């Protein structure tokens, strides 16, 4: 674990808390290893809970997002030149563990190159569980700590799925207290439903397109829409124009 400690990152201001990062092997046979980043809470906040943070995609990295442009301790300067402190980092209040998942995302990797074409909720959940078990073994001072799993987007899937293994697992070292999901997939149908209504109520699609979507997509999955569904969304996309779908009232990056 001590080997995982980070001294100072390039262009990183001096701080009052520690950080670690490194790989954990989740599938020996396959050669699947996951990269993590642990940013701890300062001493005055200790002993703080342990919070596992997961970004979605699927295929998106928790370090990239969560850690770097969201709740992580720092923000990257332009041209990836340096770091600035995130005044509102969540590590002000908890021990935050960022997990690049699944294998192949961010810095995580697979020895078995086909891994990359067979990813899924099950394996992802399973490998994460593994990661956890091993991680704790390497950070035994974390055993028994209050533990929470949190994430956003596709992680609406990852969080509870993992939460479930864990809970069922009957792993006594992991004190799972709950989970938190931000803007996440919860139920395909309902989500599809609320999605369209929201768009229409935001003047982002036409009446017809609103209707086309409700008719094409309500029986699909968000991740695996039917071809009707995509045809529909292709239109919606044309209607939405050059706006940032993830933040309606803010500008798009011009670079």
């Amino acid at each position: 674990h001590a080997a995982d400690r980070i001294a100072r990152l390039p262009g990183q201001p001096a701080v009052d808390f520690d950080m670690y990062s490194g790989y954990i092997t989740v599938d020996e046979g396959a050669g699947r290893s996951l990269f993590y980043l642990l940013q701890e809470a300062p001493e005055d906040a200790q002993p703080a809970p342990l919070v596992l943070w997961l970004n979605g995609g699927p295929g998106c990295s928790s370090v990239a997002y969560g850690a770097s442009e969201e709740l992580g301790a720092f923000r990257v300067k332009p041209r990836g030149a340096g770091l600035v402190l995130n005044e509102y980092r969540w590590n002000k209040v908890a021990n935050v563990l960022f997990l690049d998942s699944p294998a192949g995302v961010g810095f995580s990797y697979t020895n078995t190159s086909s891994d990359i074409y067979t990813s899924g909720d099950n394996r992802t959940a399973h490998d994460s569980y593994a990661f956890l078990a091993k991680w704790f073994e390497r950070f035994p001072h974390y055993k028994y700590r209050d533990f929470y799993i949190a994430g956003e987007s596709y992680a609406g899937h990852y969080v509870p799925e993992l939460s479930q293994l864990v809970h069922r697992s009957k792993n006594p070292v992991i004190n799972l207290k709950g989970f938190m999901v931000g803007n996440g997939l919860i139920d395909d149908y309902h989500d599809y439903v609320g999605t369209f209504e929201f768009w229409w109520n935001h003047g982002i699609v036409s009446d017809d397109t609103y209707r086309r979507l409700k008719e094409a997509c309500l029986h699909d999955s968000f991740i695996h829409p039917s071809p009707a569904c995509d045809a529909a969304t292709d239109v919606a996309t044309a209607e939405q124009g050059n706006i940032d779908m993830y933040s309606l009232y803010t500008p798009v990056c011009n670079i």
């Binding site: 803007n183 149908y189 989500d191």
Partner: protein, 153 residues
């Protein structure tokens, strides 16, 4: 103050050999591919993905776990209404009807407490809450951790 180009920066920063080093990343220089924020392949080669999480929710809710769901209200990708309808499908009972929550003197967003779940909206935030509403996102996290309802007044 807000910067939509953040991913540009990260991608730069993570590709640096000094940062990888300090991170203990790509120790052997073996990863013969550039670091990216997402993997399009995985992204496009996705397999199993149940339609609903509701059942896990029911489970864990029964198991007595703490469950919070939140939503940045100006996101269009996985929007608020989507979440509203989904949670509503759980049919839980209300312990505290929809009320405005505050950060100092402002409305940070809204919240509703059910029997077994807390739902919270973050007024004015896009998909990445801690990016668009950093101050309020932090408040959210603290109350969740304390298992305490978002604050009125």
């Amino acid at each position: 103050s807000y910067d939509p180009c953040t991913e540009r920066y990260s991608t730069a920063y993570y590709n640096r050999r000094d940062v990888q080093m300090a991170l203990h990343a790509n120790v052997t220089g073996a990863m013969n591919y550039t670091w990216a924020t997402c993997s399009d392949t995985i992204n496009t080669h996705w397999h199993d993905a149940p339609r609903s999480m509701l059942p896990i929710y029911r489970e864990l809710i029964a198991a007595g776990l703490r469950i919070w769901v939140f939503s940045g209200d100006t996101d269009a990708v996985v929007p608020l209404t989507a979440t509203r309808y989904s949670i509503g499908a759980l049919g839980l009972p209300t312990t505290t009807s929809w009320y405005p929550w505050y950060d100092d003197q402002e409305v940070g967003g809204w919240s509703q407490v059910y029997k077994g779940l807390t739902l919270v909206s973050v007024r004015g935030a896009g998909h990445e809450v801690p990016l668009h509403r950093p101050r309020q996102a932090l408040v959210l996290f603290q109350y969740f951790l304390q298992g305490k309802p978002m604050p009125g007044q």
